[PDB]
Amino acid sequence: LSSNLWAAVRARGCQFLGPAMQEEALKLVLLALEDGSALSRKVLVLFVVQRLEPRFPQASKTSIGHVVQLLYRASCFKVTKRDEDSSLMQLKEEFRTYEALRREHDSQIVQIAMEAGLRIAPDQWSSLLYGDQSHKSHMQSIIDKLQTPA
Protein backbone atom coordinates (compact mmCIF):
# COMPACT_ATOMS: atom_id res chain seq x y z
CA LEU A 1 0.00 0.00 0.00
CA SER A 2 2.59 2.52 1.19
CA SER A 3 4.88 1.19 -1.50
CA ASN A 4 2.26 1.99 -4.12
CA LEU A 5 1.67 5.48 -2.68
CA TRP A 6 5.36 6.49 -2.61
CA ALA A 7 5.88 5.22 -6.13
CA ALA A 8 2.96 7.37 -7.27
CA VAL A 9 4.49 10.41 -5.44
CA ARG A 10 7.93 9.92 -7.05
CA ALA A 11 6.20 9.36 -10.40
CA ARG A 12 5.38 13.06 -10.23
CA GLY A 13 8.81 14.37 -9.27
CA CYS A 14 8.05 14.69 -5.58
CA GLN A 15 9.11 12.79 -2.56
CA PHE A 16 8.13 12.14 0.95
CA LEU A 17 11.24 11.28 2.95
CA GLY A 18 9.59 9.70 5.94
CA PRO A 19 7.93 11.43 8.90
CA ALA A 20 10.95 12.77 10.79
CA MET A 21 13.00 13.92 7.80
CA GLN A 22 9.99 15.56 6.07
CA GLU A 23 9.06 17.47 9.18
CA GLU A 24 12.61 18.90 9.47
CA ALA A 25 12.80 19.55 5.72
CA LEU A 26 9.58 21.60 5.81
CA LYS A 27 10.60 23.49 8.90
CA LEU A 28 13.82 24.57 7.13
CA VAL A 29 11.90 25.68 3.98
CA LEU A 30 9.74 27.73 6.35
CA LEU A 31 12.80 29.07 8.15
CA ALA A 32 14.09 30.42 4.80
CA LEU A 33 10.77 31.71 3.38
CA GLU A 34 8.42 32.55 6.28
CA ASP A 35 9.57 36.23 6.16
CA GLY A 36 8.99 36.69 2.42
CA SER A 37 12.50 36.01 1.20
CA ALA A 38 12.64 35.09 -2.47
CA LEU A 39 15.01 32.23 -3.21
CA SER A 40 15.98 30.39 -6.36
CA ARG A 41 15.55 26.61 -6.20
CA LYS A 42 19.40 26.44 -6.07
CA VAL A 43 19.61 28.52 -2.91
CA LEU A 44 16.60 27.08 -1.21
CA VAL A 45 17.92 23.49 -1.61
CA LEU A 46 21.42 24.53 -0.52
CA PHE A 47 20.06 26.15 2.62
CA VAL A 48 17.97 23.10 3.52
CA VAL A 49 20.40 20.21 2.60
CA GLN A 50 23.24 21.88 4.58
CA ARG A 51 21.25 21.77 7.81
CA LEU A 52 19.74 18.39 7.16
CA GLU A 53 22.85 16.39 6.15
CA PRO A 54 24.25 15.87 9.66
CA ARG A 55 21.19 14.10 11.08
CA PHE A 56 19.91 12.74 7.77
CA PRO A 57 22.72 11.28 5.62
CA GLN A 58 20.08 10.54 2.98
CA ALA A 59 19.72 14.32 2.35
CA SER A 60 20.99 15.31 -1.06
CA LYS A 61 20.18 18.06 -3.53
CA THR A 62 18.06 15.52 -5.45
CA SER A 63 15.87 14.36 -2.57
CA ILE A 64 15.38 17.89 -1.16
CA GLY A 65 14.64 19.22 -4.61
CA HIS A 66 11.88 16.58 -4.78
CA VAL A 67 10.41 17.88 -1.52
CA VAL A 68 10.47 21.43 -2.98
CA GLN A 69 8.67 20.09 -6.08
CA LEU A 70 5.91 18.64 -3.88
CA LEU A 71 5.26 22.10 -2.40
CA TYR A 72 5.54 23.61 -5.88
CA ARG A 73 2.93 21.19 -7.26
CA ALA A 74 0.82 22.13 -4.25
CA SER A 75 0.95 25.79 -5.52
CA CYS A 76 2.60 26.84 -2.23
CA PHE A 77 4.86 29.34 -3.98
CA LYS A 78 4.58 32.74 -5.69
CA VAL A 79 7.07 32.54 -8.50
CA THR A 80 9.00 35.53 -9.83
CA LYS A 81 10.08 34.89 -13.42
CA ARG A 82 13.16 36.53 -14.95
CA ASP A 83 14.83 35.50 -18.32
CA GLU A 84 18.13 37.09 -17.49
CA ASP A 85 18.11 34.95 -14.27
CA SER A 86 16.75 31.98 -12.26
CA SER A 87 13.13 32.22 -11.18
CA LEU A 88 12.62 32.94 -7.45
CA MET A 89 10.08 31.36 -5.11
CA GLN A 90 8.32 32.97 -2.20
CA LEU A 91 5.96 31.21 0.20
CA LYS A 92 2.46 32.53 -0.43
CA GLU A 93 1.27 34.62 2.50
CA GLU A 94 -1.35 32.08 3.57
CA PHE A 95 1.32 29.34 3.86
CA ARG A 96 3.88 31.13 6.09
CA THR A 97 3.09 29.10 9.20
CA TYR A 98 4.06 25.46 9.78
CA GLU A 99 0.44 24.36 10.35
CA ALA A 100 -0.76 25.81 7.04
CA LEU A 101 2.29 24.63 5.09
CA ARG A 102 2.01 21.14 6.50
CA ARG A 103 -1.73 21.01 5.81
CA GLU A 104 -1.17 21.89 2.17
CA HIS A 105 1.73 19.43 1.90
CA ASP A 106 -0.40 16.58 3.31
CA SER A 107 -3.33 17.60 1.06
CA GLN A 108 -1.14 17.30 -2.01
CA ILE A 109 -0.16 13.75 -1.05
CA VAL A 110 -3.82 12.75 -0.41
CA GLN A 111 -4.55 14.30 -3.86
CA ILE A 112 -1.83 12.15 -5.40
CA ALA A 113 -3.40 9.05 -3.75
CA MET A 114 -6.70 9.95 -5.49
CA GLU A 115 -5.03 10.60 -8.78
CA ALA A 116 -3.48 7.18 -8.50
CA GLY A 117 -6.81 5.52 -7.49
CA LEU A 118 -5.16 4.36 -4.38
CA ARG A 119 -7.71 4.40 -1.57
CA ILE A 120 -6.53 5.09 1.99
CA ALA A 121 -8.11 5.42 5.42
CA PRO A 122 -7.40 8.23 7.95
CA ASP A 123 -5.81 5.72 10.36
CA GLN A 124 -3.28 4.69 7.70
CA TRP A 125 -2.58 8.31 6.69
CA SER A 126 -1.54 8.99 10.25
CA SER A 127 0.82 5.96 10.17
CA LEU A 128 2.33 6.91 6.77
CA LEU A 129 2.85 10.67 7.21
CA TYR A 130 3.33 10.89 10.96
CA GLY A 131 4.57 7.43 12.06
CA ASP A 132 1.92 7.33 14.84
CA GLN A 133 -1.83 7.10 15.24
CA SER A 134 -2.17 10.70 16.35
CA HIS A 135 -3.28 12.58 13.23
CA LYS A 136 -6.21 10.65 11.80
CA SER A 137 -8.50 13.60 12.60
CA HIS A 138 -6.16 16.14 11.01
CA MET A 139 -6.17 13.79 7.98
CA GLN A 140 -9.92 13.42 8.05
CA SER A 141 -10.48 17.13 7.66
CA ILE A 142 -8.01 17.20 4.76
CA ILE A 143 -10.02 14.38 3.04
CA ASP A 144 -13.26 16.29 3.73
CA LYS A 145 -12.03 19.28 1.75
CA LEU A 146 -11.21 17.24 -1.34
CA GLN A 147 -14.75 15.74 -1.26
CA THR A 148 -18.25 17.04 -1.89
CA PRO A 149 -19.35 19.15 1.11
CA ALA A 150 -22.06 17.71 3.43
PDB file of C-alpha atoms in Angstrom:
ATOM      1  CA  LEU A   1       0.000   0.000   0.000  1.00  0.00           C
ATOM      2  CA  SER A   2       2.591   2.518   1.195  1.00  0.00           C
ATOM      3  CA  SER A   3       4.878   1.191  -1.504  1.00  0.00           C
ATOM      4  CA  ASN A   4       2.258   1.987  -4.124  1.00  0.00           C
ATOM      5  CA  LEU A   5       1.667   5.481  -2.676  1.00  0.00           C
ATOM      6  CA  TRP A   6       5.359   6.489  -2.607  1.00  0.00           C
ATOM      7  CA  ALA A   7       5.880   5.217  -6.134  1.00  0.00           C
ATOM      8  CA  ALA A   8       2.963   7.369  -7.273  1.00  0.00           C
ATOM      9  CA  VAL A   9       4.485  10.412  -5.436  1.00  0.00           C
ATOM     10  CA  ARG A  10       7.929   9.922  -7.050  1.00  0.00           C
ATOM     11  CA  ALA A  11       6.196   9.359 -10.402  1.00  0.00           C
ATOM     12  CA  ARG A  12       5.380  13.059 -10.227  1.00  0.00           C
ATOM     13  CA  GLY A  13       8.814  14.375  -9.273  1.00  0.00           C
ATOM     14  CA  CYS A  14       8.050  14.691  -5.580  1.00  0.00           C
ATOM     15  CA  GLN A  15       9.109  12.794  -2.558  1.00  0.00           C
ATOM     16  CA  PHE A  16       8.125  12.136   0.954  1.00  0.00           C
ATOM     17  CA  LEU A  17      11.245  11.276   2.949  1.00  0.00           C
ATOM     18  CA  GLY A  18       9.585   9.697   5.941  1.00  0.00           C
ATOM     19  CA  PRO A  19       7.933  11.428   8.904  1.00  0.00           C
ATOM     20  CA  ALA A  20      10.950  12.766  10.791  1.00  0.00           C
ATOM     21  CA  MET A  21      12.997  13.923   7.802  1.00  0.00           C
ATOM     22  CA  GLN A  22       9.986  15.558   6.069  1.00  0.00           C
ATOM     23  CA  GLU A  23       9.062  17.469   9.180  1.00  0.00           C
ATOM     24  CA  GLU A  24      12.607  18.896   9.465  1.00  0.00           C
ATOM     25  CA  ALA A  25      12.804  19.549   5.717  1.00  0.00           C
ATOM     26  CA  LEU A  26       9.581  21.596   5.814  1.00  0.00           C
ATOM     27  CA  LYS A  27      10.602  23.489   8.896  1.00  0.00           C
ATOM     28  CA  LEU A  28      13.823  24.567   7.132  1.00  0.00           C
ATOM     29  CA  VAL A  29      11.899  25.678   3.978  1.00  0.00           C
ATOM     30  CA  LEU A  30       9.738  27.726   6.348  1.00  0.00           C
ATOM     31  CA  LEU A  31      12.796  29.071   8.145  1.00  0.00           C
ATOM     32  CA  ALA A  32      14.095  30.420   4.802  1.00  0.00           C
ATOM     33  CA  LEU A  33      10.765  31.712   3.380  1.00  0.00           C
ATOM     34  CA  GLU A  34       8.417  32.552   6.276  1.00  0.00           C
ATOM     35  CA  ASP A  35       9.572  36.227   6.160  1.00  0.00           C
ATOM     36  CA  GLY A  36       8.986  36.686   2.422  1.00  0.00           C
ATOM     37  CA  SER A  37      12.500  36.012   1.198  1.00  0.00           C
ATOM     38  CA  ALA A  38      12.638  35.092  -2.468  1.00  0.00           C
ATOM     39  CA  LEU A  39      15.006  32.234  -3.213  1.00  0.00           C
ATOM     40  CA  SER A  40      15.976  30.392  -6.359  1.00  0.00           C
ATOM     41  CA  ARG A  41      15.554  26.612  -6.196  1.00  0.00           C
ATOM     42  CA  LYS A  42      19.396  26.438  -6.073  1.00  0.00           C
ATOM     43  CA  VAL A  43      19.614  28.520  -2.911  1.00  0.00           C
ATOM     44  CA  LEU A  44      16.600  27.080  -1.208  1.00  0.00           C
ATOM     45  CA  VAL A  45      17.917  23.488  -1.608  1.00  0.00           C
ATOM     46  CA  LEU A  46      21.419  24.527  -0.523  1.00  0.00           C
ATOM     47  CA  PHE A  47      20.058  26.146   2.622  1.00  0.00           C
ATOM     48  CA  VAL A  48      17.966  23.102   3.520  1.00  0.00           C
ATOM     49  CA  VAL A  49      20.399  20.214   2.595  1.00  0.00           C
ATOM     50  CA  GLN A  50      23.235  21.878   4.584  1.00  0.00           C
ATOM     51  CA  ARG A  51      21.254  21.774   7.808  1.00  0.00           C
ATOM     52  CA  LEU A  52      19.738  18.386   7.163  1.00  0.00           C
ATOM     53  CA  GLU A  53      22.849  16.390   6.146  1.00  0.00           C
ATOM     54  CA  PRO A  54      24.248  15.869   9.663  1.00  0.00           C
ATOM     55  CA  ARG A  55      21.187  14.101  11.079  1.00  0.00           C
ATOM     56  CA  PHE A  56      19.906  12.737   7.775  1.00  0.00           C
ATOM     57  CA  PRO A  57      22.724  11.283   5.625  1.00  0.00           C
ATOM     58  CA  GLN A  58      20.083  10.542   2.976  1.00  0.00           C
ATOM     59  CA  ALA A  59      19.718  14.318   2.353  1.00  0.00           C
ATOM     60  CA  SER A  60      20.987  15.310  -1.062  1.00  0.00           C
ATOM     61  CA  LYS A  61      20.177  18.064  -3.529  1.00  0.00           C
ATOM     62  CA  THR A  62      18.059  15.523  -5.450  1.00  0.00           C
ATOM     63  CA  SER A  63      15.873  14.363  -2.569  1.00  0.00           C
ATOM     64  CA  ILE A  64      15.380  17.890  -1.160  1.00  0.00           C
ATOM     65  CA  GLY A  65      14.643  19.219  -4.613  1.00  0.00           C
ATOM     66  CA  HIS A  66      11.879  16.578  -4.775  1.00  0.00           C
ATOM     67  CA  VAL A  67      10.409  17.882  -1.524  1.00  0.00           C
ATOM     68  CA  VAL A  68      10.468  21.426  -2.977  1.00  0.00           C
ATOM     69  CA  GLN A  69       8.665  20.091  -6.082  1.00  0.00           C
ATOM     70  CA  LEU A  70       5.910  18.639  -3.878  1.00  0.00           C
ATOM     71  CA  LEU A  71       5.259  22.099  -2.396  1.00  0.00           C
ATOM     72  CA  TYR A  72       5.536  23.607  -5.878  1.00  0.00           C
ATOM     73  CA  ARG A  73       2.930  21.191  -7.261  1.00  0.00           C
ATOM     74  CA  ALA A  74       0.825  22.125  -4.252  1.00  0.00           C
ATOM     75  CA  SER A  75       0.946  25.789  -5.517  1.00  0.00           C
ATOM     76  CA  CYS A  76       2.604  26.838  -2.235  1.00  0.00           C
ATOM     77  CA  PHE A  77       4.855  29.335  -3.978  1.00  0.00           C
ATOM     78  CA  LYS A  78       4.578  32.739  -5.687  1.00  0.00           C
ATOM     79  CA  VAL A  79       7.074  32.545  -8.503  1.00  0.00           C
ATOM     80  CA  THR A  80       9.003  35.530  -9.826  1.00  0.00           C
ATOM     81  CA  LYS A  81      10.082  34.893 -13.420  1.00  0.00           C
ATOM     82  CA  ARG A  82      13.162  36.527 -14.948  1.00  0.00           C
ATOM     83  CA  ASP A  83      14.828  35.503 -18.325  1.00  0.00           C
ATOM     84  CA  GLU A  84      18.131  37.088 -17.495  1.00  0.00           C
ATOM     85  CA  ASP A  85      18.112  34.949 -14.265  1.00  0.00           C
ATOM     86  CA  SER A  86      16.753  31.979 -12.259  1.00  0.00           C
ATOM     87  CA  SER A  87      13.133  32.224 -11.184  1.00  0.00           C
ATOM     88  CA  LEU A  88      12.619  32.940  -7.454  1.00  0.00           C
ATOM     89  CA  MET A  89      10.077  31.361  -5.112  1.00  0.00           C
ATOM     90  CA  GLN A  90       8.321  32.966  -2.205  1.00  0.00           C
ATOM     91  CA  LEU A  91       5.963  31.215   0.198  1.00  0.00           C
ATOM     92  CA  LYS A  92       2.457  32.526  -0.426  1.00  0.00           C
ATOM     93  CA  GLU A  93       1.268  34.624   2.496  1.00  0.00           C
ATOM     94  CA  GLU A  94      -1.349  32.084   3.569  1.00  0.00           C
ATOM     95  CA  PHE A  95       1.323  29.337   3.864  1.00  0.00           C
ATOM     96  CA  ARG A  96       3.882  31.134   6.089  1.00  0.00           C
ATOM     97  CA  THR A  97       3.091  29.104   9.199  1.00  0.00           C
ATOM     98  CA  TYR A  98       4.058  25.465   9.777  1.00  0.00           C
ATOM     99  CA  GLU A  99       0.442  24.361  10.348  1.00  0.00           C
ATOM    100  CA  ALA A 100      -0.759  25.815   7.036  1.00  0.00           C
ATOM    101  CA  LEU A 101       2.293  24.626   5.093  1.00  0.00           C
ATOM    102  CA  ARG A 102       2.013  21.138   6.502  1.00  0.00           C
ATOM    103  CA  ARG A 103      -1.732  21.009   5.814  1.00  0.00           C
ATOM    104  CA  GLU A 104      -1.170  21.889   2.170  1.00  0.00           C
ATOM    105  CA  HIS A 105       1.727  19.434   1.901  1.00  0.00           C
ATOM    106  CA  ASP A 106      -0.401  16.580   3.307  1.00  0.00           C
ATOM    107  CA  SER A 107      -3.334  17.600   1.062  1.00  0.00           C
ATOM    108  CA  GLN A 108      -1.139  17.302  -2.006  1.00  0.00           C
ATOM    109  CA  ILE A 109      -0.158  13.753  -1.047  1.00  0.00           C
ATOM    110  CA  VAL A 110      -3.816  12.745  -0.413  1.00  0.00           C
ATOM    111  CA  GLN A 111      -4.549  14.302  -3.858  1.00  0.00           C
ATOM    112  CA  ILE A 112      -1.825  12.152  -5.404  1.00  0.00           C
ATOM    113  CA  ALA A 113      -3.396   9.053  -3.747  1.00  0.00           C
ATOM    114  CA  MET A 114      -6.695   9.954  -5.495  1.00  0.00           C
ATOM    115  CA  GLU A 115      -5.034  10.601  -8.779  1.00  0.00           C
ATOM    116  CA  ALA A 116      -3.484   7.178  -8.505  1.00  0.00           C
ATOM    117  CA  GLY A 117      -6.810   5.519  -7.492  1.00  0.00           C
ATOM    118  CA  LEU A 118      -5.155   4.362  -4.375  1.00  0.00           C
ATOM    119  CA  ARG A 119      -7.705   4.398  -1.575  1.00  0.00           C
ATOM    120  CA  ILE A 120      -6.526   5.090   1.991  1.00  0.00           C
ATOM    121  CA  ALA A 121      -8.106   5.422   5.422  1.00  0.00           C
ATOM    122  CA  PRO A 122      -7.403   8.229   7.950  1.00  0.00           C
ATOM    123  CA  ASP A 123      -5.814   5.723  10.362  1.00  0.00           C
ATOM    124  CA  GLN A 124      -3.281   4.688   7.699  1.00  0.00           C
ATOM    125  CA  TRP A 125      -2.575   8.314   6.690  1.00  0.00           C
ATOM    126  CA  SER A 126      -1.538   8.985  10.249  1.00  0.00           C
ATOM    127  CA  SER A 127       0.816   5.963  10.166  1.00  0.00           C
ATOM    128  CA  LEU A 128       2.328   6.907   6.771  1.00  0.00           C
ATOM    129  CA  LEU A 129       2.854  10.674   7.213  1.00  0.00           C
ATOM    130  CA  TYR A 130       3.328  10.889  10.961  1.00  0.00           C
ATOM    131  CA  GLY A 131       4.569   7.431  12.064  1.00  0.00           C
ATOM    132  CA  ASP A 132       1.922   7.335  14.842  1.00  0.00           C
ATOM    133  CA  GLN A 133      -1.831   7.105  15.241  1.00  0.00           C
ATOM    134  CA  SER A 134      -2.166  10.704  16.350  1.00  0.00           C
ATOM    135  CA  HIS A 135      -3.276  12.579  13.230  1.00  0.00           C
ATOM    136  CA  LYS A 136      -6.208  10.648  11.804  1.00  0.00           C
ATOM    137  CA  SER A 137      -8.499  13.599  12.596  1.00  0.00           C
ATOM    138  CA  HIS A 138      -6.156  16.136  11.009  1.00  0.00           C
ATOM    139  CA  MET A 139      -6.169  13.786   7.981  1.00  0.00           C
ATOM    140  CA  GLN A 140      -9.922  13.419   8.054  1.00  0.00           C
ATOM    141  CA  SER A 141     -10.483  17.133   7.660  1.00  0.00           C
ATOM    142  CA  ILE A 142      -8.008  17.199   4.758  1.00  0.00           C
ATOM    143  CA  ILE A 143     -10.017  14.377   3.038  1.00  0.00           C
ATOM    144  CA  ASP A 144     -13.256  16.286   3.735  1.00  0.00           C
ATOM    145  CA  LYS A 145     -12.026  19.283   1.748  1.00  0.00           C
ATOM    146  CA  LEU A 146     -11.206  17.244  -1.344  1.00  0.00           C
ATOM    147  CA  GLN A 147     -14.746  15.738  -1.258  1.00  0.00           C
ATOM    148  CA  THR A 148     -18.254  17.038  -1.890  1.00  0.00           C
ATOM    149  CA  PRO A 149     -19.348  19.146   1.112  1.00  0.00           C
ATOM    150  CA  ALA A 150     -22.056  17.711   3.426  1.00  0.00           C
TER     151      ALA A 150
END
